[PDB]
Design an enzyme around this catalytic site. Structure first.
Site, PDB file in Angstrom:
ATOM      1  N   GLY A 176       7.523 -13.920 -35.729  1.00  0.00           N
ATOM      2  CA  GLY A 176       6.401 -13.732 -36.290  1.00  0.00           C
ATOM      3  C   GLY A 176       5.960 -13.091 -37.602  1.00  0.00           C
ATOM      4  NE  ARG A 214       8.223 -16.752 -32.765  1.00  0.00           N
ATOM      5  CZ  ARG A 214       8.890 -15.556 -32.319  1.00  0.00           C
ATOM      6  NH1 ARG A 214       7.846 -14.362 -32.050  1.00  0.00           N
ATOM      7  NH2 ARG A 214       9.621 -15.122 -33.244  1.00  0.00           N
ATOM      8  CG  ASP A 226       7.966  -5.706 -39.234  1.00  0.00           C
ATOM      9  OD1 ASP A 226       6.493  -5.744 -39.401  1.00  0.00           O
ATOM     10  OD2 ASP A 226       7.915  -6.386 -37.709  1.00  0.00           O
ATOM     11  CB  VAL A 268      -0.861   0.080  -3.484  1.00  0.00           C
ATOM     12  CG1 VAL A 268      -0.264  -1.012  -3.365  1.00  0.00           C
ATOM     13  CG2 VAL A 268       0.601   0.223  -5.028  1.00  0.00           C
ATOM     14  CE  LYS A 282      -8.679  -6.084  -5.013  1.00  0.00           C
ATOM     15  NZ  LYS A 282      -9.821  -5.535  -6.311  1.00  0.00           N
ATOM     16  CB  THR A 340      -8.895 -11.760 -28.761  1.00  0.00           C
ATOM     17  OG1 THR A 340      -9.620  -9.983 -27.871  1.00  0.00           O
ATOM     18  CG2 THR A 340      -7.944 -11.021 -28.453  1.00  0.00           C
ATOM     19  CB  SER A 346      13.973 -10.788 -34.010  1.00  0.00           C
ATOM     20  OG  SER A 346      13.685 -11.421 -34.290  1.00  0.00           O
ATOM     21  CB  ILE A 364     -11.441 -10.284 -33.369  1.00  0.00           C
ATOM     22  CG1 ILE A 364     -12.666 -10.547 -35.094  1.00  0.00           C
ATOM     23  CG2 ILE A 364     -12.585 -10.195 -32.683  1.00  0.00           C
ATOM     24  CD1 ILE A 364     -13.376 -11.978 -34.397  1.00  0.00           C
ATOM     25  CE  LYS A 391      -5.121   0.858   1.332  1.00  0.00           C
ATOM     26  NZ  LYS A 391      -4.152   2.376   1.249  1.00  0.00           N
TER      27      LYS A 391
HETATM   28 MN   LIG Z   1       8.299  -8.957 -36.297  1.00  0.00          MN
HETATM   29 MN   LIG Z   2       3.778  -7.166 -38.186  1.00  0.00          MN
HETATM   30 NA    NA Z   3      -7.322 -10.338 -32.853  1.00  0.00          NA
HETATM   31 NA    NA Z   4       0.287   4.097  -2.188  1.00  0.00          NA
END
Ligand SMILES: [Mn+2]
Ligand SMILES: [Mn+2]
Ligand code: NA
Ligand code: NA
Length: 327
Positions: free
Chosen positions: A181, A141, A184, A57, A64, A93, A172, A98, A52
């Site tokens: 991924g 990948r 680019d 906080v 929690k 998602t 990368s 989406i 806290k």
């Molecule tokens: Mn990338």
């Molecule tokens: Mn991309």
């Molecule tokens: Na998405």
């Molecule tokens: Na605080």
DNA sequence: CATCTG
DNA sequence: CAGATG
């Protein structure tokens, strides 16, 4: 980094949840700074109260932290990881196209799954359609071994359309990385810059070539400087076709390539560090340029760059091979 | 931040 | 045009 691990993680699930499922941007936002500060926090949080004491906080978070520390779990987390409505949103998602918003619409109509989606391909839009079609490939990948073939293709066609194009595959992939991924690509041409009032063909031409030869399969979005597509390495001698991959192409005024190029090459960490040092050496850096820092507090004026070399030099630093740009 | 949708 | 997505 591991002393307040759970705490930071639980907090993250919470934040994540607020934003995605509910709308709680404030709340979500709340969880955020919260894990950040505890993330920096030097000791072992032995109790809520202790926490806290930190900024960001409050009482609710402390509450929690207690129950989690008191027991390996959190009811709330427990209740959320169950609830199908929450789950569905996290899943929908995953489709490219989406977002949360849409996840919510879809579920509130019963679309909660892939099939759901397929049966209602009508409700989805083109990007989302592509997304659904390539869900699988999308999560796969990209191994450097393909990356290189791809790179090889793109560079060769760009060359053909105009010897003056300058293409660079950042990411990368550029930093070593065994797999990646998405592809680019940063692009410029001499005839395109800062002032030089436009030239869209500049980007559109190549886009075409790539599709010309089938490297490019679908178009997610195609503006005048950015293009979001789908591509694919030709299937050799039929028995093994390649997965459909994500790819992005972007036009850049030649006058700001390398800062861009630098920038996209990352990593976030290497950026930051470099950026900070830049600052020490009396400079400013961002996506497009590097500027001399006036003393009045600030100031500008685009320092001229001819390579990534130009930059480092400026901030008087060690040229960093992309490989070691890690952190 | 650039693109899309509606 | 707001508002979503990447
Ligand atoms: Mn990338
Ligand atoms: Mn991309
Ligand atoms: Na998405
Ligand atoms: Na605080």
């Amino acid at each position: 980094e591991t002393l307040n691990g759970g705490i930071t993680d639980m907090l993250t699930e919470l934040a994540n949840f607020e934003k995605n499922v509910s709308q709680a941007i404030h709340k979500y936002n709340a969880y955020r700074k919260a894990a950040s500060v505890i993330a920096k926090y030097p000791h072992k949080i032995k109790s809520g109260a202790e926490a806290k004491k930190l900024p960001g906080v409050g009482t609710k978070i402390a509450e929690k932290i207690d129950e989690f520390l008191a027991t390996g779990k959190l009811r709330k987390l427990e209740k959320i990881r169950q609830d199908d409505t929450s789950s569905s949103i996290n899943f929908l998602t995953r489709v490219s196209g989406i977002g949360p918003s849409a996840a919510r619409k879809f579920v509130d109509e019963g679309i909660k799954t892939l099939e759901d989606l397929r049966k209602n391909e009508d409700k989805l839009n083109h990007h989302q359609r592509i997304g659904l079609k390539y869900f699988g490939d999308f999560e796969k990948r990209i191994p450097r071994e393909e990356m290189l073939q791809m790179q090889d293709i793109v560079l060769n066609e760009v060359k053909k359309v105009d010897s003056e194009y300058i293409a660079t595959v950042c990411g990368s992939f550029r930093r070593g990385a065994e797999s990646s991924g998405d592809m680019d690509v940063l692009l410029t041409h001499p005839s395109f810059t800062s002032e030089s009032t436009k030239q869209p063909k500049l980007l559109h031409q190549v886009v075409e070539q790539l599709q010309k030869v089938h490297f490019i399969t679908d178009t997610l979005s195609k503006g005048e400087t950015k293009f979001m597509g789908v591509c694919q390495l030709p299937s050799k001698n039929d028995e093994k076709e390649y997965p459909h991959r994500r790819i992005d192409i972007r036009l850049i005024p030649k006058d700001q390539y390398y800062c861009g190029v630098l920038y996209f090459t990352g990593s976030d960490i290497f950026n930051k560090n470099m950026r900070a040092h830049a600052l020490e050496k009396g400079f400013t850096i961002n996506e497009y340029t590097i500027r001399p820092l006036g003393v009045t507090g600030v100031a500008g004026e685009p320092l001229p760059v001819d390579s990534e070399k130009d930059i480092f030099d400026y901030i008087q630093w060690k040229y960093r091979e992309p490989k070691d740009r890690s952190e």
